[PDB]
Amino acid sequence: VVCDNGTGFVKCGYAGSNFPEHIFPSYPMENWDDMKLLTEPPMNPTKNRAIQAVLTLYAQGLLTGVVVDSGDGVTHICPVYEGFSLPHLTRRLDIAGRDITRYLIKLLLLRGYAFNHSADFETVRMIKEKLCYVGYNIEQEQKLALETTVLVESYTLPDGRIIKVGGERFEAPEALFQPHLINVEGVGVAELLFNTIQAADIDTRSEFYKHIVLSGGSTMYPGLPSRLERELKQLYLERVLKGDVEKLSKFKIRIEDPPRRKHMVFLGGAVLADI
């Protein structure tokens, strides 16, 4: 019986198993009386105490690589070298699920919808999960939103009213790459990921790059994997290749975005617990 307790939802069930037999809401955890194999975040207080990034890579049948786990409160970039993780080289991005949902609420309120951040939080989160996605080329997305109506989807609110969501579908998740959009100092999951790896052994740097695996509910946005790749190719070009367009072809960036990555951590423990 493996149980991965997450900040916002709880995933638990059995070994050898396929997907959590039970997935239900948690708010005791944040990124004990209330609280009352197990998983642990990339910087759990020793005072508080398997590593999740370790479990993720494990389910993939890997021992080395970088894990981008984005859930409800915080996003982590956890590099793991043959066997165990390495806190040093592990970073955080103070942007994840809640922030995107909160941002969507603001955006929908700007277009003229009477949403209340507290009262309608759960409602908009569902809108986020059903309609939001990551833009590959924002410039391109902007044109579609401004010049056509292909992006407009209808959503029926609990009271029966119907609202319309368009450009905001990709605008909210853009927070992940442009923190300033939601008043957050930082560089964006992609640029963050880049640095994290560059700040590593030139020997392993190549091994890591070709082993970036996603994990968590916030990594499910359609297009996320492609946006990351385009972002990394860009950074690499500008910063590592200085600008030689011919070498870009040598950048081997494979971003493992497994079908069951939403709950990849659990998927691990399970299998990692028959062994």
């Binding site: 700007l110 277009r111 003229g112 009477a114 949403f115 209340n116 009262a119 309608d120 409602t123 319309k164």
Partner: protein, 393 residues
């Protein structure tokens, strides 16, 4: 600017219009338009307000239902006279503040902007949310201004219990009440039908409307009120007169129980509505209880009235009492079934209620802030009508 902005509050039964800065609208007219039922200039042959109610050769239309614009052609023309006949304002020289029903769509705001910008070339437009204006109007009673409160807007169509948190309406917690000035008039009309004679059939509604506005009030207890009347009819039965428009004759009737029975339907909807039975105090309670825990006491402590049908003497007192009882009863039963601190319930009533929204909009449109949050014509041509989807509080 040297000229004050135009402030227009269109409603199901009446449209309040005037210039920012004034304490009361310069005109309050029926939201109706009379036309002939297009080539030449036939589209201009029309009247609005009172002049359009009795036209022999014209058909009266009501562009607004349940508080929302149903006929844009007609609403647009209605504006033509609102601007050029009544206000007598050069539309290109004045900023305009209009109001909207809660839950007005973004689409509808663009339709209004299209009219105001594309037809009248106004230099600036602001579409205000009625409830917020009502909240602001109440500051005229309350020494600590706040935009968090529960608004009770009761006009002629339907009545709304609108919760407002920090200037922003919590739309998913709004509740409607199938009782309003229109329902109350019809009810009083029936009471008179059963008792008084001589009322000219064509003036039946008219007479009921009069009795309602001139003699009604809300009592604290039905049987006790009924007893005062039977025990001393001399001090409670009034007289109302009028004249038969088709006999010139004069007609008077005794006005009785209808005085307090009329408003009573807000509290006992079943008296006149077979499908609704929730007392207004309960609807309010339910609404607030549906809002976030953190905002509940501030909502209970600031229940503001707005609209013609909230004018009945003692409407606020009754509402406050009944709501307190419900609340006290609940907190008591939970202390028993088990220490919930007592909740402060307060219904605000003020002189500026018959046109609370208009007054709210007037005070806002005459402040420097306003001329900034308003969307200009420049920003309209460049970014499009979408800019009018949101109107900063």
């Amino acid at each position: 600017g040297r000229l004050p902005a135009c402030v227009v509050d269109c409603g199901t039964g009446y449209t309040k219009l005037g210039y920012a800065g004034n304490t009361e609208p310069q005109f309050i007219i029926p939201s109706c338009i009379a036309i002939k039922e297009m080539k030449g200039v036939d589209d201009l042959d029309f009247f609005i307000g009172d002049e359009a109610i009795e036209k022999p050769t014209y058909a009266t239309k009501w562009p607004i239902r349940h508080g929302i614009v149903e006929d844009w052609d007609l609403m647009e023309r209605f504006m033509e006279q609102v601007i050029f006949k009544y206000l007598r304002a050069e539309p290109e020289d004045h900023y305009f503040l209009l109001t909207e029903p809660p839950l007005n769509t973004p689409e509808n705001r663009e339709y209004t902007a299209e009219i105001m910008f594309e037809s009248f070339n106004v230099p600036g437009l602001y579409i205000a949310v009625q409830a917020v204006l009502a909240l602001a109007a109440s500051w005229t009673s309350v020494g600590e201004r706040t935009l968090t409160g529960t608004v009770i807007d009761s006009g002629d169509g339907v009545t709304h219990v609108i919760p407002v948190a920090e200037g922003y309406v919590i739309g998913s917690c709004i509740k409607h009440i199938p009782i309003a000035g229109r329902d109350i008039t019809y009810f009083i009309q029936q009471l008179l039908r059963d008792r008084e004679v001589g009322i000219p059939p064509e003036q039946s509604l008219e007479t009921a409307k009069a009795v309602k506005e001139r003699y009604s009030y809300v009592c604290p207890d039905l049987v006790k009120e009924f007893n005062k009347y039977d025990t001393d009819g001399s001090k409670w039965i009034k007289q109302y007169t009028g004249i038969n428009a088709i006999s010139k004759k004069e007609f008077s009737i005794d006005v009785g129980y209808e005085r307090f029975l009329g408003p009573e339907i807000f509290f006992h909807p079943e008296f006149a509505n077979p499908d609704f039975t929730q007392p207004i105090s309960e609807v309010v309670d339910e609404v607030i209880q549906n809002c976030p825990i953190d905002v509940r006491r501030p909502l209970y402590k600031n229940i503001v009235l707005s609209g013609g049908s909230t004018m009945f003497r003692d409407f606020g007192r009754r509402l406050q009492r009944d709501l307190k009882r419900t609340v006290d009863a609940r907190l008591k039963l939970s202390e028993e079934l088990s220490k919930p601190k007592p909740i402060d319930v307060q219904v605000i009533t003020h002189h500026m209620q018959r046109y609370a929204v208009w007054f709210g909009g007037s005070m806002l449109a005459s402040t420097p802030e306003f001329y900034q949050v308003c969307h200009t014509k420049k920003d309209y041509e460049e970014i499009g009508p979408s800019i009018c989807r949101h109107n900063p509080v």
